[PDB]
Scaffold this motif. Structure first.
Motif, PDB file in Angstrom:
ATOM      1  N   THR A  92      -7.867  -3.265  66.414  1.00 48.09           N
ATOM      2  CA  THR A  92      -8.071  -4.562  65.782  1.00 48.09           C
ATOM      3  C   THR A  92      -6.891  -5.476  66.079  1.00 48.09           C
ATOM      4  N   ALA A  93      -7.174  -6.757  66.264  1.00 48.71           N
ATOM      5  CA  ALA A  93      -6.135  -7.728  66.541  1.00 48.71           C
ATOM      6  C   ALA A  93      -5.604  -8.297  65.240  1.00 48.71           C
ATOM      7  N   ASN A  94      -4.314  -8.629  65.249  1.00 49.40           N
ATOM      8  CA  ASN A  94      -3.695  -9.271  64.105  1.00 49.40           C
ATOM      9  C   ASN A  94      -3.997 -10.761  64.065  1.00 49.40           C
ATOM     10  N   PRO A  95      -4.834 -11.241  63.124  1.00 46.77           N
ATOM     11  CA  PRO A  95      -5.097 -12.687  63.059  1.00 46.77           C
ATOM     12  C   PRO A  95      -3.889 -13.499  62.669  1.00 46.77           C
ATOM     13  N   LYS A  96      -2.842 -12.859  62.139  1.00 46.77           N
ATOM     14  CA  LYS A  96      -1.637 -13.570  61.753  1.00 46.77           C
ATOM     15  C   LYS A  96      -0.610 -13.615  62.875  1.00 46.77           C
ATOM     16  N   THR A  97      -0.964 -13.140  64.068  1.00 49.25           N
ATOM     17  CA  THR A  97      -0.063 -13.207  65.207  1.00 49.25           C
ATOM     18  C   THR A  97       0.361 -14.646  65.457  1.00 49.25           C
ATOM     19  N   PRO A  98       1.648 -14.958  65.416  1.00 49.04           N
ATOM     20  CA  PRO A  98       2.100 -16.303  65.767  1.00 49.04           C
ATOM     21  C   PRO A  98       2.147 -16.465  67.278  1.00 49.04           C
ATOM     22  N   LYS A  99       2.297 -17.714  67.713  1.00 46.31           N
ATOM     23  CA  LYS A  99       2.767 -17.949  69.067  1.00 46.31           C
ATOM     24  C   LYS A  99       4.137 -17.291  69.181  1.00 46.31           C
ATOM     25  N   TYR A 100       4.359 -16.547  70.255  1.00 41.26           N
ATOM     26  CA  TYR A 100       5.603 -15.798  70.328  1.00 41.26           C
ATOM     27  C   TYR A 100       6.002 -15.572  71.772  1.00 41.26           C
ATOM     28  N   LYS A 101       7.280 -15.246  71.955  1.00 40.83           N
ATOM     29  CA  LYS A 101       7.768 -14.737  73.220  1.00 40.83           C
ATOM     30  C   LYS A 101       8.812 -13.676  72.909  1.00 40.83           C
ATOM     31  N   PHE A 102       9.068 -12.832  73.895  1.00 36.49           N
ATOM     32  CA  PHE A 102      10.154 -11.866  73.848  1.00 36.49           C
ATOM     33  C   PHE A 102      11.319 -12.416  74.653  1.00 36.49           C
ATOM     34  N   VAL A 103      12.507 -12.439  74.055  1.00 38.85           N
ATOM     35  CA  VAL A 103      13.683 -12.932  74.754  1.00 38.85           C
ATOM     36  C   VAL A 103      14.818 -11.942  74.583  1.00 38.85           C
ATOM     37  N   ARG A 104      15.725 -11.954  75.539  1.00 43.16           N
ATOM     38  CA  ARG A 104      16.957 -11.202  75.430  1.00 43.16           C
ATOM     39  C   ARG A 104      18.084 -12.187  75.182  1.00 43.16           C
ATOM     40  N   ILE A 105      18.788 -12.025  74.065  1.00 44.60           N
ATOM     41  CA  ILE A 105      19.785 -13.017  73.684  1.00 44.60           C
ATOM     42  C   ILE A 105      21.138 -12.636  74.265  1.00 44.60           C
ATOM     43  N   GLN A 106      21.984 -13.649  74.420  1.00 45.81           N
ATOM     44  CA  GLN A 106      23.334 -13.487  74.928  1.00 45.81           C
ATOM     45  C   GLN A 106      24.297 -13.270  73.776  1.00 45.81           C
ATOM     46  N   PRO A 107      25.395 -12.580  74.020  1.00 43.18           N
ATOM     47  CA  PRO A 107      26.405 -12.452  72.970  1.00 43.18           C
ATOM     48  C   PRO A 107      26.881 -13.831  72.541  1.00 43.18           C
ATOM     49  N   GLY A 108      27.141 -13.962  71.246  1.00 36.73           N
ATOM     50  CA  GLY A 108      27.470 -15.240  70.642  1.00 36.73           C
ATOM     51  C   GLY A 108      26.295 -15.995  70.058  1.00 36.73           C
ATOM     52  N   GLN A 109      25.079 -15.729  70.525  1.00 33.03           N
ATOM     53  CA  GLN A 109      23.898 -16.362  69.970  1.00 33.03           C
ATOM     54  C   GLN A 109      23.538 -15.733  68.622  1.00 33.03           C
ATOM     55  N   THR A 110      22.897 -16.531  67.775  1.00 33.50           N
ATOM     56  CA  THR A 110      22.525 -16.094  66.442  1.00 33.50           C
ATOM     57  C   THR A 110      21.011 -15.903  66.346  1.00 33.50           C
ATOM     58  N   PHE A 111      20.611 -15.162  65.315  1.00 34.83           N
ATOM     59  CA  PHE A 111      19.199 -14.918  65.061  1.00 34.83           C
ATOM     60  C   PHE A 111      19.037 -14.459  63.622  1.00 34.83           C
TER      61      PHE A 111
END
Ligand SMILES: *C(=N)[C@H](C[C@@H]1CCNC1=O)NC(=O)[C@H](CC(C)C)NC(=O)OCC(C)(C)Sc1ccccc1
Ligand SMILES: *C(=N)[C@H](C[C@@H]1CCNC1=O)NC(=O)[C@H](CC(C)C)NC(=O)OCC(C)(C)Sc1ccccc1
Lengths: 300, 301
Positions: A92-111
């Motif tokens: 089953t698919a998640n209907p609450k799936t947002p628009k999304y991407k996978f990213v790799r962050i650099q040191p110093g970046q926040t999340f």
């Protein structure tokens, strides 16, 4: 005012599920018809010491994986491994799936981190990827599979999945391709990190935040060259400041009328003299987990 | 230190945020069941705010003067009333994302999560403590009024704060969800100021308990104190006096550590009277006062 602010977590909450294999339960991220989670869910306490994951995984069947979204079980119809992340295909698919991407962050970046237990969100807070590729989080047993993310427009960029705690109390994990940040491994061993350094461009941003909010005791009439600043920074285990960092700090400089290298001369004085008991924005220590963008967004 | 300000997951509140506009004045509202709650000064022009007569401004208003939107989708208003400094707008749609909820009035020292919003769109979430002078140290820009503060207990959202104002010292003031201000503030664009603030003693004690839980316990002594003697001393250091409710909410941490509340009070009194003498607690020379006993339990256990 100025606070460490996390992104609103609702778009991620609607993706969190519980994944159980044997007597191991942790969190998964349910996007479309795939659930992502740390692969060490398949290990026993015996396996964790030195796990041959490809060998352990081939011995598993789809029905060994119990996935729960609240009160509802999701049927696993396929599974694969991508580095340290397991991908469980469900029917089953998640209907609450947002628009999304996978990213790799650099040191110093926040999340932002959404800390979860048994598939249930528990808390949200802001983190930085340290220069030594740890994060200073708050995670307990059962937190693995909790994710870190940023939101831009209505797009959620996932950058972190939680896997482990180090003896010093800092944390390590992977991007959503399952590759660790840093020299860490998903085995049950005590692992040390490389020597950490302070994120200089972020300290500067935070000093500009303190000025915007009327705190100026640390300013001075002097200036420094970029290279002479970097010499002192490196001596004190601060990261070097690049010209791109100086450029990135422009808006804060323009807004306050304090030139970047003037603020560098202020920080140089603080590193050499200390705070002498004073505080900046309530803190007795120089804060390095606000980026220039974080300060801009929140101060304007 | 090992501790950090952690907010509650904000999704259940995000699903309740709307925008409310009168004229060109837009602020945020909270949509629960078929009622939208928002600050009553949405009915003011910028010039009315200097000296508003709220009852008179409201009697001139009709349901069709209120623009309520969830995103860009209008929510028709079918009734309106004023409760203290909050406007209640009855709407024709029950919010399908309404969580289990309650309205609570919190005490100084209690912490809560703020979902900072603009034009009904959430921007960020952060943890706040209600100061003894009934201000919070928030982060709010123009258009933030109507943003709410909340706690989440199991699946029930306890709404405790709605944002109304920024004071000259950069701190923030607001109401509960029944529209009663915290502290002596009024919703008028007139010079106001926060009273002298004090340190939240119950939370400092929670912090000392947290230190003990983590094995940092050099500050424990063999002495005790009475509650009254401690309170009289504390006030001389601009610390808040303890209430019986404070003693009660430290109960779980006292049980977890085996350190009686009044023994920990005696240890704190010695820190106040003698200073740290260069030592640290949880890695800091400063005593933290914006972690409640519940917060410490959340992050240790
Ligand atoms: C995932 N659910 C947990 C999250 C950990 C638990 C505690 N806080 C956290 O962030 N992940 C693990 O338990 C991982 C699993 C392995 C297979 C990667 N292991 C782990 O994090 O171990 C921590 C140590 C090694 C026990 S630290 C220590 C060493 C020696 C003496 C005291 C502590
Ligand atoms: C609601 N959207 C705003 C939120 C304010 C805007 C900037 N940061 C904030 O938190 N609320 C107001 O503008 C209120 C509205 C009235 C009707 C209560 N006005 C306000 O906060 O003004 C401050 C005071 C009461 C005039 S005190 C002060 C005097 C001089 C300088 C700063 C503050």
């Amino acid at each position: 005012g100025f606070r460490k602010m996390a992104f609103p977590s609702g778009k991620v909450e609607g993706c969190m599920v519980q994944v159980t294999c044997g007597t191991t339960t942790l969190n998964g991220l349910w996007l479309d018809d795939v659930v992502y989670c740390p692969r060490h869910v398949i290990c026993t306490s015996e396996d964790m010491l030195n796990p041959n994951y490809e060998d352990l995984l081939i011995r598993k069947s789809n029905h060994n994986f119990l996935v729960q979204a609240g009160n509802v079980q999701l049927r696993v119809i396929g599974h694969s491994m991508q580095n340290c992340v397991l991908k469980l295909k469900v029917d089953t698919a998640n209907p609450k799936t947002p628009k999304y991407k996978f990213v790799r962050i650099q040191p110093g970046q926040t999340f932002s981190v959404l800390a979860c237990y048994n598939g249930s969100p528990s808390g949200v807070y802001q983190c930085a990827m340290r220069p030594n590729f740890t994060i200073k989080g708050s995670f307990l047993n059962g937190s693995c599979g909790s994710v870190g993310f940023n939101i831009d427009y209505d797009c959620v960029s996932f950058c972190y999945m939680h896997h482990m705690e180090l003896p010093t109390g800092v944390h390590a994990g992977t991007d959503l391709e399952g590759n660790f940040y840093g020299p860490f491994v998903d085995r049950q061993t005590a692992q040390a990190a490389g020597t950490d350094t302070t994120i200089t461009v972020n300290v500067l941003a935070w000093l500009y935040a303190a000025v915007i909010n009327g705190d100026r005791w640390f300013l001075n009439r002097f200036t420094t060259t970029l290279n002479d600043f970097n010499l002192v920074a490196m001596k004190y285990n601060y990261e070097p400041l690049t010209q791109d960092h100086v450029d990135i700090l422009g808006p804060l400089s323009a807004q306050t009328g304090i030139a970047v290298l003037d603020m560098c001369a202020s920080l140089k004085e603080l590193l050499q003299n200390g705070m002498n008991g004073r505080t900046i924005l309530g803190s007795a220590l120089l804060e390095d987990e606000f980026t220039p963008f974080d300060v801009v967004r929140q101060c304007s």
